[PDB]
Amino acid sequence: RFASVYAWNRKRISNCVADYSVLYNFAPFFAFKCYGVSPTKLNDLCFTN
């Protein structure tokens, strides 16, 4: 289940290597809009959390 907006959830991601290509395997994304980062170049940047 997904918590409603009146009480939103929040989870951190860190201490792991990430691959967003498998993200395409779940479902087709309706919008998939990236504002500040090029969506194609999400696999060559190292972040904190």
Partner: protein
């Protein structure tokens, strides 16, 4: 002048633009950043279904 004609679902018409997202603008067609022309569309659900 040129011409490219096709029937396609009207819920993704917004994907027809230089540097747009979605399957139409990424994996099925693309327009360059130097496009100088026009785009026309009109309803075709009833006629071809």
């Amino acid at each position: 002048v040129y011409a490219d004609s096709f029937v396609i679902r009207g819920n993704e018409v917004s994907q027809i633009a230089p540097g747009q997202t979605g399957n139409i603008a990424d994996y099925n067609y693309k327009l360059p950043d130097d496009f100088t022309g026009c785009v026309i569309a009109w309803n075709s659900n009833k006629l071809d279904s």
